[PDB]
Design a protein around this nucleic acid. Sequence first.
RNA 1: AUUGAAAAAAAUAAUAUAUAUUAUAUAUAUUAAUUAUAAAUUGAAAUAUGUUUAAUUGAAUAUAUUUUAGUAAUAGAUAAAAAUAUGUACAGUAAAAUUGUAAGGAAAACAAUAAUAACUUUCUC
RNA 2: GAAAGAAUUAAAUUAAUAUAAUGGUAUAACUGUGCGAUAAUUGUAACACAAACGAGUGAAACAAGUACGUAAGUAUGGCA
Lengths: 64, 93, 93, 113, 348, 274
Amino acid sequence: SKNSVIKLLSTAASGYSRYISIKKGAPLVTQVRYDPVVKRHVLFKEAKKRKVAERKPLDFLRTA
Amino acid sequence: TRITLPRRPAKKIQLGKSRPAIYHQFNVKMELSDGSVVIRRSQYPKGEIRLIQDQRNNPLWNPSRGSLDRFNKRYSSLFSTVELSEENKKKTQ
Amino acid sequence: RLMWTFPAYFYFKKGTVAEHKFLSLQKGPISKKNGIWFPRGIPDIKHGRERSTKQEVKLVNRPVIPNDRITEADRSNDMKSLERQLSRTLYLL
Amino acid sequence: SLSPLAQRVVTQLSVMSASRKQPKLLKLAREDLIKHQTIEKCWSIYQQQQRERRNLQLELQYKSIERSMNLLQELSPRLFEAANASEKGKRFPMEMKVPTDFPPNTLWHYNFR
Amino acid sequence: HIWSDFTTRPSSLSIQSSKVKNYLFQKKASLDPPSISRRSNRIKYSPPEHIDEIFRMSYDFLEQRSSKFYELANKTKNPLKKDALLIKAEINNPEVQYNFQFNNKLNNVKDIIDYDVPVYRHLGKQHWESYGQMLLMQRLETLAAIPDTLPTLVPRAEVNIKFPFSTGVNKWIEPGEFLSSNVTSMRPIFKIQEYELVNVEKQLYTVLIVNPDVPDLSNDSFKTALCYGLVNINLTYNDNLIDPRKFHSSNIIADYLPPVPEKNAGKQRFVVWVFRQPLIEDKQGPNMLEIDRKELSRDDFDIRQFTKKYNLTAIGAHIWRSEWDAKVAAVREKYGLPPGRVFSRVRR
Amino acid sequence: PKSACSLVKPVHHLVKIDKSKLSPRFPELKYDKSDIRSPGFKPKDTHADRLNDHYLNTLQSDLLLINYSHNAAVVKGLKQRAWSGDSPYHLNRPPKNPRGSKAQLPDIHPIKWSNIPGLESVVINCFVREARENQLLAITAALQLQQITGCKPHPIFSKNDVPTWKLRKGHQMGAKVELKGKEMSQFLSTLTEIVLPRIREYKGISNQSGNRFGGISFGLTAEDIKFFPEIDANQDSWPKTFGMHININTSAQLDYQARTLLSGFQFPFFGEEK
RNA sequence: AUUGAAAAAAAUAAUAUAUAUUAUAUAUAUUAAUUAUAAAUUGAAAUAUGUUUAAUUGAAUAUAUUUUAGUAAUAGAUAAAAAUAUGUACAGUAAAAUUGUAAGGAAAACAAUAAUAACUUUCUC
RNA sequence: GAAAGAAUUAAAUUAAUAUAAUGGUAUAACUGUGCGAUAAUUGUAACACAAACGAGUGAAACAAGUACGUAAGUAUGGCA
Ligand SMILES: [Mg+2]
Ligand SMILES: [Mg+2]
Ligand SMILES: [Mg+2]
Ligand SMILES: [Mg+2]
Ligand SMILES: [Mg+2]
């Protein structure tokens, strides 16, 4: 399995949720879409937990 | 294997805010082989330079106007033409 | 006014006799210090330069002394001489 | 972290880079800005005039050459032919040097070859 | 020194501020700029070095050039050429540049920016071409106010409108704005700023506000509607605000009827057009023209036909666009217009 | 996206709408880079350019005099030939490519007061091939270039891929710098006076070198770069040093004219000319 | 505002404050910033407080308080090296072949290679 | 007569298009860049194309909300 399915649950606690597909070790996928219960654009976040390909956090502060 | 300097996140130059690279430059006097001085802008900090080998003493740039040297130095008392005439019998070849 | 800072750290290595002379020749910028009024704004300094102003950088072993552009011939007003005007195009009449 | 060679490369890079080496922006007052504009415009005009003068002079020279060559063609055909040759490999003489800022010790050479 | 002389030359070419003028013309960089009002900021400020002597030299150079131009300008007889010469003479004057750049062009005070002066007028034209004219052209093309009403426009005069009498607030209308029915309840005010050399005494103008987007249900299309029509208006380069003060009741060929868009009829373009009159020779004074007031109709109005009839040339334009809101019924009631129709939401 | 169909609508006016001016997004960018109010401002005409002045005074008139050919007409270049209409298949046919060449060549004009040859631009291409191993070498080369010129270099990247030479695609390898105006002139003057005399056995730029149209070139070894005064002043700061190509671009119609011009600026020419 | 130098004001735009209107307007004041961001027993600079030399300032040196040095690429709305493959806004043109050029060679990189009639502005005979 | 601009004409889609092949694409659908990361959103979708049914395809419009754009507008994933 290369591309897995996930459940994005609305942040405005309606219960509304949208499902999308991602690569197995993709970053946490949050997106702003229309919640029809609330009748506005709200944040969606992943309901379940899963492991991620850990990227090194690129440093803008010039280290050393 | 490939030796590199790994890049940091690039700094966003905004459109319109880009400024031209005006490097720090000193006015430098070059005295050539002869006494002709010329001013040139230069990044290295030296107000005056005098040059030894230039176009103004090269034969290619003015046609109208060191083993050998070592040899000359260490066979100077003898003074080494007359010498050629003495040591040039053309029978044997 | 718009020129960059002179990157002295490159041209002069830290803890060297040549650097020390350069430092002595130079004079530093006035830094910001708490509890004081700076009526020409607070000092903006990076690599030891007031960003708000122009920077001045003061610098065989012989001084390069250029020759005088006016000549002896020019002074005398000798019309037959070729060295009489050095900055102009002379024509034979 | 880094080698001495890596450090020296970084220093070299810095020399070229605009990172923390450049001053504040050149702000002007409105009167000062106007004065600057008038300085620049006048200068530009002067430069244009100079260009026209030089260009005009060149045109005049060209006209004179044309006038000469027609006359030469009319009079002596051989002389005209000699004048009008291909000067493909013509090289400026190496004595005609680019005028320096200050003159040399020996201004002029009276002897040659 | 031609630019210091004000015997024949207008007063507007000088800077009216004394301090600013003094700062401009000094022998050393001793004084501090009048623009910087605050003491601390003046102290902080440092002008670029050597600027004075060079500036003075530049002034002398351009002053000499101006003087030379003036030598030609007075000998010239034909008017457009003379004006062009005058412009050439004074355009590089620092004082006139200061005046124009840093003071308002829209509501110009005559002593600072005089549009009677040719140079200032040229500057104003150039400024208009740089932004406002382009914008106007874009709004005419995008909204489709050109081909729908009047084929083309060659923008010559800068036209700005206002609605002072309705609400109370002061605002010049940006082209292609959505105005409320309250805002456009009473009539607008025009300002036709002319930049070409034109006979101020003789040249008359007409102003027509037209609504191409009123629905005609017999044709199953739209028809035009002359919402406001003025004729024979006198403009002057400085005195150019077309207000009930200026124009008389005789000038009004069709008195202002407000935008009253119907519900679901859509967005309605109101595109004011400014024409200049045809100028007749061998006749002193302003040549008027009579309009057949029974012939031209307001509920249906061929703008192009009208233009052809009276030999007009469209020099300027401006546009707003109104759509239905709650207060249009109130506006109709105030004006005594009928209740107003209501259309289906679907364009079936 | 409902469609990909690109189709610019016609307009009903001749006014040229500058779309950049109608926005309020980039207020600093509306000013020209020549204008003082722009952050992109740089003092251009800072001092009197010496080589340029010399060209103006002495050379340009001489060059004009040299290049005068009596009643010389224009020599048209090789162009795309049209088909003779001796067949109905010629009717919307693309034109035949030029005679010898695949690309079209320019017309050679007679030299008059307007179109006298002169220096247009210098380009200093330095592609260091050891930088396939070491990226830091490219940086050092760029610095060297900057030092030499007093102008900001631009990084060269490997555009191609090849196995024989150990070369990847998209790898920083040396640098280039297009000099123009006064800096270029200075660089030429330095080349003529300081550097090219200190090369021991140098005859000249080859007469077989160059473009077909007003462009001449040559190159300097790593040995030759140590004569540049910014390099020359300190041997110690530069342990390594990289060669370079030097593309001189003239306003010359043909290459012999360009060579003659360069000779006027004290560049020696040695080989047998074409 | 105090400080330096030797009556006021008349744009745009931004910022601050106020109010006008079923109008993101107007009024007054002022022109900031603009390539930066934590962490340095070691480099460099300033200021303050002492001491010694030629009330004095320069010069030298000690402590304190700061400031700088973390040195890192794009400087251009970048435009066919590589990299964010869906939106939108603005802008531009590729390729091949040919002629050259330091190592460079058929094959690394860079340069150059169709025509200006008319139009606008600028300078000029 | 010169400089600069606006450009126009000719040529080109042989490169490039995430991917086959074909059609299309410089008015670019290709490429660069700012913002953004939203429309790779939510309910009704007529009417067509295609079509035994099951399905498939293009899609005006109405309503809710979002992003970019000075605006006009564009976006209900990708030139097809
Ligand atoms: Mg294809
Ligand atoms: Mg069918
Ligand atoms: Mg079916
Ligand atoms: Mg696409
Ligand atoms: Mg695609």
